[PDB]
Amino acid sequence: RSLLDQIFKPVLEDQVLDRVGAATKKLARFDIFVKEKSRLVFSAGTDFGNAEGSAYTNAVVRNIFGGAETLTVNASTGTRTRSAYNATFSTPINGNPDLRLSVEALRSATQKPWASHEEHLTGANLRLAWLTEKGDTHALAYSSVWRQLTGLAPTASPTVRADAGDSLKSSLTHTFTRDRRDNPMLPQSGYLFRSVSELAGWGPLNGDVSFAKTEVEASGALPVKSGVSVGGGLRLGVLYPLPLGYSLTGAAQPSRINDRFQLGGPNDVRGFKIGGLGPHDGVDAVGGDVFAAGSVNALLPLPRTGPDSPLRLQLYANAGRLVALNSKGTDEGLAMDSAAVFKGVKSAVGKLTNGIPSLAAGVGLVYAHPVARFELNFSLPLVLRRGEEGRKGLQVGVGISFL
Amino acid sequence: RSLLDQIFKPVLEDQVLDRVGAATKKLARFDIFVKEKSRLVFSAGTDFGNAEGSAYTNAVVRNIFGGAETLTVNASTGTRTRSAYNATFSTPINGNPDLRLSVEALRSATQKPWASHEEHLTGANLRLAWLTEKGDTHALAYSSVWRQLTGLAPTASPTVRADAGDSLKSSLTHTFTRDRRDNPMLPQSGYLFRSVSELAGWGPLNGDVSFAKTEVEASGALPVKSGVSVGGGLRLGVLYPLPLGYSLTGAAQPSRINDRFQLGGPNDVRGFKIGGLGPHDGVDAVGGDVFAAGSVNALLPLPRTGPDSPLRLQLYANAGRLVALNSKGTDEGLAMDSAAVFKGVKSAVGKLTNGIPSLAAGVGLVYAHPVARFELNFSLPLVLRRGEEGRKGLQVGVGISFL
Amino acid sequence: YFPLRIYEPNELPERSQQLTSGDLPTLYVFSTDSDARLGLPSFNPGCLKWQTLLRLANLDFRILPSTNHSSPTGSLPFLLPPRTSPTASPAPIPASGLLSFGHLDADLPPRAQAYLALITHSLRNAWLCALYLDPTHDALLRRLYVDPASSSRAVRAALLHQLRRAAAEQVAVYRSARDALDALASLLRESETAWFGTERPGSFDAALFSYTHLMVEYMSEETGRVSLGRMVKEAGNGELAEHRERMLGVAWPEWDGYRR
Amino acid sequence: YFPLRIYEPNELPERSQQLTSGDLPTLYVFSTDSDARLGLPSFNPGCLKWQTLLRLANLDFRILPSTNHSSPTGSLPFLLPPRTSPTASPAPIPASGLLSFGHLDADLPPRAQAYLALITHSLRNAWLCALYLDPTHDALLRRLYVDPASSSRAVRAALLHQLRRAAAEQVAVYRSARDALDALASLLRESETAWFGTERPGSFDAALFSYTHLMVEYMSEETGRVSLGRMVKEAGNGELAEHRERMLGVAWPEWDGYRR
């Protein structure tokens, strides 16, 4: 009762005034809906009968003490070890549904075809999903994971054969969002902004890897109700190695293939293979440290029809430049002092400025579904750095984040 | 062991001779595959948490004693009573996988929108799926069902408000097939033939309803490798009432709405609503007793491409005439003696001859998938009897049986 | 736009040609086809009420047995207007609108409003128990609600059970019905207008005739717990008995066959 | 057809620039980076075998520690050819093809074929038990297989267990190893050619050096059940001890540091 009393009293304490709409939004934020939302759910798609049991499972618990929630998934297939831990938890914190908290203990096998290997995560994390009143979101995290690489089946590389061990990566991120977008899937006249800056191993945050990854974003839109809706886009990113103990100068072990940016595909830069635009090694796509991006868009509305059902046109011209961090300086297995790595990135960013990076181009057919965004484009990569695996056919794009 | 020994010995008892291919086909017919087919399967898509449990279920058992099989389905939704009996059974008979047998105890709610009501079957049957060696199939059945009508929600009719009781209908069918078709979904140069003649209530076959429904079929194809593939089609049908006790002359109660043919839809006669071409009552589609059908087809192959992937064109001109059985003769609630009903159908077939029945026409885009057949036609009904609910847009057709 | 010809809608089948065409409105009730031809009263009281009402309103019609699934609502006794277009029919009339299709449904003093709750809520129960629960009357329920349903002993046991269960929960009680018929007997001995206060019998006399009659015809079997067939004729000085006979001289002034 | 320009492939990152570029073929073995610079022998016998083989074949190369996931097959000791194109590399060579990349792998009399099954199937087990199972040696297994793996006590307990379990099932046995080293000691006392029948040591001497050496260096801890470090030097008249020293004067004729 007090859960709602604490928000009723600020309304009750005061021609006529309409301050109750904010209370209604507060109520709706709890994901507990005034009739009901639901109670628990379930499923067990339990196959059987052979060397595989396939042991499906699911669960939701939409309340425990009044506002706390849980979840669970599983697939004890009998071929994969398990995904038996994908359980979560949620609870507001001392009064409001904004300052959420959470705990998860994930375990999965994130298969990667573009780099011919696999990953075996067995970690757990802890979030704090504070949503500021104006729409600006925040977050935190602390995700000690295990991050094993064991899928080197075909001829992969002599690079992805140097990264097959393990790691801890006790990270601590900090998300952000300033979403003024008019339609989350179809940016027509809105806005955007993000930041995902995490500090992986340093001082108290222990483990083995050590860096500070700093990914930024931007967006735009400007219809000059003719849905002309000129587009936009921009991204950035930096992967700066760091020492391991409570300092800023000293040893610094360079990046692995688990922590580097990969820039390409139907979701980030249209007109390239799912992983392209990188310091490629033969056939295998090794990621680079520093990178940038870009885009321009048109999103023409179907003429002689009007601002009807979401479907529109699209005329994009992407970009992208994912360099890697070389040293080529002061020539000890892997130990670069702060002076060297600094003069590495400082020079490994000059390669970003010079040169026409890359330029896809084409047309597409957007279908701004409420929950997703289907693209089905067709593009033609103009400029390329040798061995980046351009693509030219039908560029089937599906997801939530695009450029 | 003897299961295979009895078919090995006729091969072992005899340049070189190749009589083993027939043995391989016999082995393959068992649906037991030399490595394996499978063992049991399962699922329980069990929702929960509200006034509905939705209680999904499934099961397969691909062997018990060596060749016998079973099945089960269920949905104890908590809104529908249940579908909790949809269980089957299978077993070869004294030596071969041809002379199959079976038992099922179905229970379902076959909803019917075109006639605004529902059906509640709770019956059980018994098959004998003899497959003759040449490809000609046979069958039998004995399906005492319950067949209740209880869905008269909206304004339905004063016709479907005269058929709301119950029935038994202890039928006994006899299927058939002479399938020479080259591709089961895409008839290009093959053939076909069928017959579904059942005797519902008479003599030993007890119950309440009494008739003898006799549905025939035909087909054709003739490519004049240019896949021109001229089409064909034809059907028939007769619903002849019969007395109830061990005789051929006497009482005869006329047809109900549960036992009458309905001729229309994207699967039987393209170019009409899912139920059309009948003795319509206002908005509700009451079926008729005697009927016929027809079709002609083109199935043009995509020019300048060749006999490539199954997709082809289609140019059809259907037909159809589903009369009902009136008496208008010798004018006792519902009791027509054999003399009258005979002179009814004998005259209720003259209405079939006279008059241009109906003629749909259009184009389509066939996609002869291995398991199904997608149509997505577009038709334009030329001739009509008033109030048959023609249709003109996109005629989306999916299924296995078409014209 | 394109359909080229129009060809004389296709002559509805023989069943509906014979049953639901008619000329007069065909009221649906619970009855046996033997009585359908003669317009005799139903055997379910919740429908005999409306039937007696209509036939008091001097409206003519034809009764026609049905099965309680064929109804716009759950309850059966709905009336259908005649057929005006051989392929399209009017809408049904539920039980609430028959007497819309004066003095019958008129406001009564609260006393007359009171006793009606007695009949609707007490006499109704004694009917269910004496019919749907008492095993001695497992014979008469058979000949009425299951025997003309499907006529296959594998089925009859299902419906016969579906009724008894869905009727047992809706309701020992024999005493509450005993004194109730002595109450109404007093309400009649003080009217002196051959009815319950009014010169022309209204909705109350018809609501009571709905039970005073059936319990006489189908429950007068003598074999303790004297059947309700005698209570109705013995309550007071038999003023409930004579009321029906004075009632069954207006609704059906030309039919004999009452009194078992 | 359209891509307009071509712009000098993009300079592989610092890790692969430092590790896997090389000039000579970089054999992967189990080792600690302290020994990698000095080319000292591995600590896993199933790889020291191939390493001793190659260095007998007078082929030069650089050892480079790895982690047994990075391998074309499950087993580790695979060799990589040098880098010929800074963006494209040759294919790996598994353990089966190193000596393809004469007298080493030559047919021997069946007697010499027999005793080799002793070493592969009996001495191998006594190694696992004395290392992966005996709790007194939970210290040395730590400093070798888990300590340079991830360096986080939350993780080390996982790998340390994953090994012991997956190694326990692959195998008391101490006696079977005792007499086995007296068997080979007799096979040596009858050769008189400083090796097991041949003037230049072949695949058998290297297969035995794979175990006679490690058990001396890492298992000579004196604290019953005398450790295998003494059995190797005490079997017979110490002919297994001197064999290694006569062997460790050809493969690595310039290194000192043996004998604990």
Author numbering:
A (entry chain B), B (entry chain D): 59 to 72, 82 to 100, 132 to 322, 330 to 436, 441 to 512
C (entry chain C), D (entry chain A): 26 to 126, 143 to 212, 238 to 262, 264 to 289, 292, 297 to 333
Please give sentences taken from the publication describing this entry.
The SAM complex facilitates outer membrane β-barrel precursor protein folding and insertion into the outer membrane. Sam50 forms a 16-stranded β-barrel which is minimally closed between strands β1 and β16.
3D reconstructions for the SAM complex in GDN showed a mixture of monomers and three predominant dimer conformations. Among the dimer conformations, substantial differences were observed for the Sam50 β-barrel. However, in dimers 2 and 3, the β-barrel is open, allowing for association of strands β1 in an antiparallel arrangement, extending the β-sheet across two Sam50 β-barrels. A morph of Sam50 structures from dimers 1 and 3 shows how strands β1–β4 undergo an approximate 45° rotation, opening the β-barrel between strands β1 and β16 to create space for precursor protein to bind. In Sam50, the barrel diameter by the POTRA domain stays constant while the upper ¾ region of strands β1–β4 can flip outward. All of the dimers appear to be non-physiological, with an up-down association of SAM complexes not anticipated from functional studies. Our structures illustrate how Sam50 can open sufficiently at the lateral gate to accommodate precursor binding at strand β1, positioning L6 at the lateral gate through its interaction(s) with strand β16.
